[model samples]
Target: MEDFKKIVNNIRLKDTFDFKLAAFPNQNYDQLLPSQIYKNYYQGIEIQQHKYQNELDIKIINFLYPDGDFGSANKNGTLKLSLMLTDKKNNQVYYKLLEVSGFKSNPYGVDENGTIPGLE
Candidate 1:
């Protein structure tokens, strides 16, 4: 748990990247590969994780709106969240944390006061 937290802190996201040629006797030999990581899209936020007992815990900082205010993003104030796990050997696994199906949205707007149309 402590080790995971330390590793997370030790990692620093790079702002610029350089292209390098791959070495021989390996996959994608002589191919150009990215040496650093750069974020061109997507918003930035602080992310941290830890382990309490046998369960893993994550903390996202500087995100979300103020209490009682959810008007920043999304039409229905909805978003999908998931988790990805990677071991030391680079084995990867993905798990869905939040997913909702069959959700119907009102096309007439959320504050329709008159006779509602298409009330199915």
Candidate 2:
């Protein structure tokens, strides 16, 4: 079934091109299957997946941020990830509208503390 049917709406890459996310209806987590990733999270997030064919190809779409659209609604702005490096000049390869909400510890993740992921 190489049809581009939309199985999930929350995922961004689905409507991009020939990308279609399908689920393997009756899947088990103990066994390993191609395109099936069983990720259980205690300190992070939890997910359920799918399988197709005897081969099984599936993906789970989830969001950690609050509900509603994170993208710029009714405007030209789009959402993207920026790798902001920590330096005296806020060293980075580029810059964007850096918006961080509900951040605690007095901006420890961005500048001196290095609390951000990848850079951590």
Candidate 3:
């Protein structure tokens, strides 16, 4: 696996619009085998910087195709994003959610969500 922790650890609370995102395929025999493959929602990782009309300017990246492309094998009418943070020392946990539409179609022929086909 890639060192995603390093990228995540580099995130600071001060830089509001700075963030990194990536996506990976399942690493298994029945799933991905030796060849790397993604799922319906995992065509290619995209980094998008969204400016919310003077209120907020944030950088966002998603595990989808590039602009004007269908990145999913099946059409997804909605896209939901959820992030969770853990405060180990303070024993606190927080979560955030975002929902949007206009996703890309899958061209890689990936069927499921790889190892995470079922949500925990």
Candidate 4:
């Protein structure tokens, strides 16, 4: 099996765009079979699949603040991002995204006021 942790750590933020992001699936599954053939036949071949999903929360915020400061007022960005994944078999794998509320600093003050700014 591929080292998902290593793969995630090596993922480059620069490779993705503001509205788009890439990441490895966050869930782990181990199929036990009586034999290799049983595993292959029943579990099917293990193939790595990669897909991209949009994080509407951040996209909405970014649309509100198209020119907001990033990494200075927040050191991360004006918006948070979520990445979802699915297996090659179309099984729902996992979903995760950094919370904007947890940012070290929120220039937009969405955390402090619970308001999405331009969303108002």
Best by lDDT: 3
In order, candidate lDDTs are 0.25, 0.23, 0.32, 0.29
> Total clashes, candidate 1?
0
For candidate 2, write residues 1-120 as lDDT tens digits.
Answer: 322233212123222211112343333322211112111212232222222222222222232212223222112122121212122232222222221222122211122223232352
Worst 10 residues of 4 by lDDT: 55-64
TM for candidate 1 is: 0.24
Q: After aligning candidate 4 to the native by TM-score, how far in Å is the CA of 28 from where it should be?
A: 34
Per-residue lDDT of model 4, residues 36-68, tens digit only: 111123322223223132211112111111134
Superposed by TM-score, candidate 4 places the C-alpha of residue 73 at a distance from the truth, in angstroms, of 8.1
Q: TM-score per candidate, in order?
A: 0.24, 0.17, 0.26, 0.27
Worst 10-residue lDDT window for candidate 2 reads 32-41
Task: Count clashes in each candidate, considering only residues at least 3 apart in sequence or on different chains.
Answer: 0, 3, 7, 0
| Runs with alpha carbons beyond 4 Å of true place in candidate 4 | 16-77, 87-92, 99-120
The runs of at least 3 residues in candidate 2 whose Cα sits more than 4 Å from the true structure, single-residue gaps closed, are 10-42, 51-120
Task: Name every residue pair that clashes in candidate 1.
Answer: none
Ranking the candidates on lDDT from highest down gives 3, 4, 1, 2
Name the best candidate (by TM-score).
Answer: 4
Q: Rank the candidates by TM-score, best first.
A: 4, 3, 1, 2
Better of 3 and 4 by TM-score: 4
lDDT of 1: 0.25
